[PDB]
Design a protein around this nucleic acid. Structure first.
Ligand SMILES: Nc1ncnc2c1ncn2[C@@H]1O[C@H](COP(=O)(O)OP(=O)(O)NP(=O)(O)O)[C@@H](O)[C@H]1O
Lengths: 148, 68, 709
RNA sequence: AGCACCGUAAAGA
C-alpha cells in the first residue's frame, strides 16, 4: 500500500535473502507438492472423488490416480467408473500424497505406491496443521505396539 | 531410374496444399399461406453495422457491398 | 552382493538367446502364442525377430542387441498392437526429437491411435501409445502423473546413447523409478556386456529378462582404403569377414611413397555406379567447402530438378516472403538441384528435414553429413565414405572409435536394391596393422554408465518420502557394474586366507560409491537455503525443482536477490541466453551498460555459489563455472525480441544459425519454467514479464513446424 | 586435420 509493505496476518515475519513472508500460527492446510496427507471423502462424482482436508477448498482425487487391486494396471474404463463407488465408499479415509496444486487453490492428489491408499480401522485425530514439524517419514511404526 | 514421386512422401500435408406416397387428395397440393416472423421478407433493411466518414473503413466497404 | 542367475537357451544358429532371472527361481521356458497374432507381417520373420515376439507375447521384458537394418523395429510394433489389444497403454522413448517425429508419423499411419510429447509440441496425449523423449518420462516418474498407473509396456530406442556423460543419467534414473509390475523392451546396438545389463534389470525389478544378440546382417559390406593420391582402392576385408592385410600393406607402402581429392573419389564412385553415397566428415566447414568444390557436377536430369523445385516450394511456403530470401536457402537450392546435399548441426531444421526426405527418395546421391544420420534415421544407402578418421569429442582430438565407425557403416546396404554395400576410408597418416585392425574389425566398446549426481535429482528426491538418493546410487549401473571388478582384491584376500585390504574391501563389497559428492551437494543446499538440517526441503527447493533446463541454484538466487524485479521484459531473456548458450565464438561482443550491468550481478552471485561449493570441496573451479555461461548472444536476443528480421540477426555474430535456434528454443522452455517458478513463490508481475518475453520471441521460423508432422 | 600466434630466408619497387 502506497509504496509500503504492510502485514496482513498475525505472526512472526521471516526474511529470506530478499523475500519477506509471514508464518502465521493458525491456518488451514495450503497445498504443497510432495506433502503426504490424510483425507476423509465427501463425494463421488462421475469422474473422480471429492475429499475433505483442512484446506480452503475440496481436495480432488482423480479416478486415474487411485491404485488398482494388486498391480492389475491396464487403463481406466467405465467398469472402473462404476466400481468407483463400491470400493471407496463415501466417508472413507485415504492416506495419499499431493500430486499438484491448481491455480484455483485446490489440490489434486494421488497414490504413488501401495504403502498409500485406503486405511484400515484404526483411530483418528484432527489438530491444527501448524503443529506438525515439516520433516520426512511421516509414516512411523513405533515400538510401543502401533503406528502413526 | 524414376520419373514420379512416392506415396509415403505424397501423403504429407505441405504437399497436398425410404419411401413415398401419392395422396390424390393432397398430392399436387401446396400451402397457400405460410407463417413468417421475420421483418426482412416483410420489409427491406440496410446492413446493421455502418460508419460515417472514416471510422473503420472496412465497415464502409461492407456498406457498399451489402446495401445493393 | 546382488545374487542373480543367468542362463542360456538351446536355439539355432543365427542369433543367441539368454535369460537373466532371480537367483532363486527355476526356469520354465517360453510358450507358444494363444490365438491370433497381434500383427501379421508381409514377409517371414527371422529367428531373431520371432524369438523377440515369442518373448513379448508371454509378457516378459527383453533386450535386443543387433546391428541396425535388421528389422529391429518389429518387436516395437508387435508390443504396441498387443497393448492396444488388451486396453493397456504403451510408451515409446526416443531421445531425439526428429527421430520421434518420424516414429510418430509411422505409428500414426499404422495404428491411428498415438500421441506425441516433446519439448516443442504435444499431440493426442489420450493415446494408448505415447511417443516422446525420455526426460519427459523422468518428470512423469517423479510427479506420478496419470500414465504410470496405466502404461504396462515401455520400449527404449538407443540405450547405447546412454553411454554418454551428460545424459546417461536419464535412462538409468527412469528405470530405477519404474514399478516392478511393468514390462518393457530395449533396442540397442551390438554390446558385449548384455549379461550385466540383464542381471541389473533383474536385480532391479526382481523380474526375469531376456537377451537377444546377433552379428547377422542382410546386406554385407566391403571395406576399402584410399590413401592420398594413390588413385587406387585397396581391399582390407571382404564380405566373408576375411581380412587380407596384403592389400593393406600395399596401401601403407603407398602412404610411405607419397612422402581436389574427394572430388576425384566421388567421380570414381559415380563412374562405378556406386551411387548413392554418404559422406561422413567430422566438421561443418569441410562439408560446406566440399559441396562448394563439387558444385560443378550434376547427378540429376532436368525433370528431377523441376520436381525438387516443386517439393522445395511446397515445403518452404510455410514461411514468410523474407525468410525465403535467406542466403542459406538460395545458396543451397542449386546444390539440391544437382543431386548433392549437405547436412550438419548448423542449418535451419526446415532444410534439414527437406534434405532427409529428398535423400529417402533418391533425388540426391552424395550427402555430406557428419554424425546426424549415424543415429536417428533409417535412410540407408549403397556406399559410404569416411573423409577422415580423426574427430573431436569432449576435449580430446581422438581417433575414430570402432563403435562410431560401425554406427556409420551400418548405413551402407539398402535391402533388396543393393546386393552389398561399399565402405571406404580416406587416410593420410601412417597407421600400422594394430590400430587399423582394432579399428575396422575390432569389437564394439562396452556400455559403461556415467551416473553423475545432479541438483535437480537431489531436490526432486527430497520432495518424496519413499525414495532417497542413496537408494538410487545403490540401484544404478555405476554400482552394479562395480561388483564384477570387486573379485580382484577379494580374490587376493581369499588367497591370503593384505589384511588391511581384507577389512576394507570386505566392508566395501556391497557398499556405496560417489557418496562424498552427495554429502557435499547437501552441504551446499543447506548453506544456500535449498534445504535445512534434518535433510528436509525449503521453499528455494520447491522453486528450483520446477527448473530442469539450466543451472537452477543460480536462477533461484537471482530471484531471491531481486534482479528481474527491476529489469525489463527482454533483458531477462538475455540474462537467460547467458545460460542456455554453451558454445564458444571468435569475438566476444561489446555490450551496452543497460544490458551488461545485470550480468555483473549475475557473476557476483555465481562467485558466491563458487565459494560455497569450494567450502565443501566439490573439486570445482571458479573461473570455469563462472565462464560456463556465455553472454555471446545477449545482443542477438535483444534485437530479436525487438521484433527484427532473422537476416538482421544472423550477421551480428560469426555463429551458425541452427545453434541460435537451439539457444532460442531452450530459452523459451526455460521461460515457461521460470513462469511456473514465479507462479510458485507468489509473484505475478515477474511471470507476466516472462510470458511476454515468450510472446515476443515466437514470430516466424525459430518455432516452425516439422515437415514430418 | 584445421585456425591463430611468433621467428626465419628470399623477390620487387
Ligand atoms: N526381416 C525383414 N525382411 C525383409 N524386409 C525387412 C525386414 N525387416 C525390415 N524390412 C524392411 O525394412 C523397411 C524399413 O526398414 P527399417 O525401418 O530401417 O528397419 P529398422 O529395424 O526399423 N531400422 C521395411 O519397410 C521393410 O520393407
Amino acid at each position: 500500500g502506497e509504496e509500503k509493505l504492510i502485514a496482513s496476518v498475525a505472526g512472526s515475519v521471516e526474511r529470506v535473502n530478499k523475500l519477506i513472508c509471514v508464518k502465521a500460527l493458525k491456518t488451514r492446510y495450503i497445498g504443497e507438492v510432495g506433502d503426504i496427507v490424510v483425507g476423509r471423502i465427501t463425494e463421488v462424482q462421475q469422474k473422480r472423488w471429492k475429499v475433505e482436508t483442512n484446506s480452503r477448498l475440496d481436495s480432488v482425487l482423480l479416478l486415474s490416480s487411485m491404485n488398482l487391486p494388486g498391480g492389475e494396471l491396464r487403463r481406466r474404463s467405465a467398469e472402473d467408473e462404476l466400481a468407483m463407488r463400491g470400493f471407496l465408499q463415501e466417508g472413507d479415509l485415504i492416506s495419499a500424497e499431493v500430486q499438484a496444486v491448481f491455480s484455483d487453490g485446490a489440490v489434486s492428489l494421488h497414490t504413488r505406491s501401495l504403502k498409500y491408499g485406503k486405511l484400515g480401522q484404526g483411530v483418528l485425530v484432527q489438530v491444527s496443521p501448524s503443529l506438525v514439524k515439516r520433516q520426512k517419514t511421516h509414516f512411523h511404526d513405533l515400538p510401543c505396539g502401533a503406528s502413526v | 531410374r524414376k520419373t514420379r514421386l512416392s506415396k509415403n512422401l505424397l501423403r504429407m500435408k505441405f504437399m497436398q496444399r425410404h419411401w413415398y406416397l401419392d395422396l390424390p387428395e393432397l398430392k399436387e397440393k401446396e400451402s397457400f399461406i405460410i407463417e413468417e416472423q421475420s421483418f426482412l421478407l416483410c420489409e427491406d433493411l440496410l446492413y446493421g453495422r455502418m460508419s460515417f466518414r472514416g471510422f473503420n473503413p472496412e465497415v464502409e466497404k461492407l456498406m457498399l457491398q451489402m446495401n445493393a | 552382493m546382488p545374487r542373480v542367475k543367468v542362463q542360456s537357451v538351446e536355439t539355432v544358429e543365427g542369433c543367441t538367446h539368454e535369460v537373466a532371472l532371480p537367483a532363486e527361481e527355476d526356469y520354465l521356458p517360453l510358450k507358444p502364442r494363444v490365438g491370433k497374432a497381434a500383427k501379421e507381417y508381409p514377409f517371414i520373420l527371422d529367428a531373431f525377430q520371432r524369438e523377440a515376439i515369442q518373448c513379448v507375447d508371454n509378457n516378459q521384458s527383453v533386450l535386443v542387441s543387433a546391428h541396425t537394418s535388421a528389422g529391429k523395429t518389429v518387436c516395437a510394433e508387435y508390443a504396441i498392437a498387443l497393448a492396444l489389444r488388451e486396453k493397456q497403454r504403451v510408451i515409446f522413448t526416443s531421445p531425439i526429437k526428429a527421430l520421434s517425429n518420424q516414429k510418430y508419423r509411422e505409428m500414426y499411419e499404422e495404428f491411428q491411435d498415438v500421441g506425441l510429447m516433446t519439448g516443442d509440441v504435444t499431440i493426442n496425449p489420450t493415446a494408448s501409445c505415447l511417443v516422446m523423449t525420455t526426460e519427459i518420462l523422468r518428470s512423469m516418474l517423479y510427479r506420478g502423473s496419470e500414465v504410470m498407473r496405466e502404461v504396462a509396456w515401455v520400449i527404449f530406442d538407443e540405450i547405447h546413447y546412454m553411454r554418454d556423460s551428460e545424459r546417461g543419467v536419464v535412462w538409468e534414473e527412469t528405470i530405477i523409478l519404474l514399478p516392478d509390475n511393468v514390462h518393457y523392451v530395449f533396442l540397442s546396438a551390438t554390446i558385449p556386456n548384455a549379461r550385466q545389463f540383464a542381471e541389473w534389470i533383474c536385480h532391479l525389478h526382481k523380474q526375469p529378462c531376456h537377451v537377444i544378440y546377433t552379428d547377422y546382417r542382410p546386406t554385407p559390406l566391403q571395406h576399402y582404403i584410399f590413401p592420398a593420391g594413390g588413385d587406387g582402392l585397396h581391399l582390407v576385408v571382404d564380405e566373408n569377414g576375411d581380412f587380407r592385410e596384403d592389400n593393406f600393406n600395399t596401401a601403407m607402402q603407398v602412404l610411405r611413397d607419397a612422402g581436389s581429392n574427394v572430388f576425384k573419389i566421388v567421380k570414381m564412385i559415380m563412374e562405378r555406379n556406386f551411387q548413392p553415397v554418404i559422406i561422413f566428415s567430422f566438421s561443418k566447414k569441410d562439408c560446406e567447402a566440399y559441396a562448394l568444390q563439387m558444385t560443378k557436377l550434376d547427378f540429376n536430369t532436368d525433370e528431377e530438378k523441376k520436381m525438387v523445385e516443386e517439393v522445395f516450394s511446397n515445403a518452404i511456403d510455410c514461411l514468410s516472403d523474407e525468410d525465403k530470401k535467406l542466403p542459406q536457402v538460395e545458396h543451397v537450392l542449386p546444390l539440391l538441384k544437382r543431386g548433392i546435399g549437405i547436412h550438419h548441426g548448423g542449418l535451419l531444421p526446415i532444410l534439414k528435414e527437406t534434405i532427409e526426405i529428398l535423400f529417402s527418395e533418391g533425388l540426391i546421391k552424395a550427402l555430406f553429413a557428419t554424425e546426424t544420420f549415424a543415429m536417428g534415421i533409417n535412410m540407408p544407402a549403397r556406399t559410404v565414405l569416411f573423409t577422415n578418421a580423426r574427430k573431436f569429442d569432449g576435449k580430446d582430438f581422438r581417433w575414430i572409435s570402432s563403435g562410431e565407425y560401425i554406427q556409420m557403416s551400418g548405413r551402407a546396404g539398402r535391402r533388396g536394391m543393393d546386393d552389398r554395400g561399399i565402405v571406404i576410408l580416406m587416410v593420410d597418416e601412417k597407421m600400422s596393422p594394430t590400430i587399423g585392425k582394432q579399428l575396422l574389425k575390432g569389437s564394439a566398446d562396452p556400455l559403461n554408465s556415467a551416473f553423475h549426481l545432479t541438483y535437480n535429482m537431489v531436490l526432486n528426491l527430497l520432495r518424496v518420502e519413499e525414495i532417497n538418493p542413496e537408494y538410487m546410487l545403490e540401484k544404478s549401473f555405476y554400482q552394479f557394474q562395480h561388483y564384477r571388478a570387486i573379485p580382484g582384491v577379494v580374490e587376493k584376500v581369499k588367497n591370503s586366507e593384505d589384511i588391511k585390504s581384507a577389512k576394507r574391501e570386505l566392508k566395501k563389497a556391497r557398499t556405496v560409491l560417489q557418496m562424498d559428492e552427495l554429502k557435499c551437494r547437501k552441504r551446499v543446499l543447506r548453506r544456500l537455503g535449498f534445504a535445512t538440517s534434518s535433510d528436509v526441503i525449503e521453499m528455494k527447493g520447491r522453486v528450483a525443482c520446477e527448473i530442469s533446463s539450466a543451472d537452477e541454484l543460480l536462477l533461484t538466487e537471482m530471484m531471491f536477490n531481486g534482479l528481474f524485479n527491476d529489469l525489463s521484459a527482454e533483458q531477462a531473456t538475455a540474462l537467460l541466453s547467458c545460460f542456455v548458450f554453451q558454445e564458444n565464438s571468435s569475438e566476444m561482443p561489446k555490450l551496452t551498460e543497460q544490458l551488461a550491468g545485470p550480468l555483473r550481478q549475475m557473476q557476483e552471485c555465481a562467485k558466491r555459489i563458487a565459494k560455497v561449493s569450494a567450502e565443501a570441496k566439490l573439486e570445482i573451479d571458479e573461473e570455469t563455472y563462472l565462464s560456463s555461461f556465455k553472454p555471446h548472444l545477449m545482443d542477438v536476443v535483444y534485437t530479436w525480441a525487438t521484433g527484427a528480421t532473422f537476416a538482421h540477426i544472423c550477421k551480428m555474430t560469426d555463429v551458425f544459425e541452427g545453434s541460435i535456434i537451439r539457444c532460442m528454443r531452450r530459452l523459451e522452455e526455460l521461460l515457461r519454467q521460470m513462469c511456473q517458478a514465479a507462479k510458485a513463490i507468489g509473484n505475478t508481475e515477474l511471470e507476466n514479464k516472462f510470458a511476454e518475453g515468450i510472446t515476443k520471441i515466437k514470430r516466424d521460423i525459430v518455432f516452425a513446424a516439422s515437415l514430418y508432422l
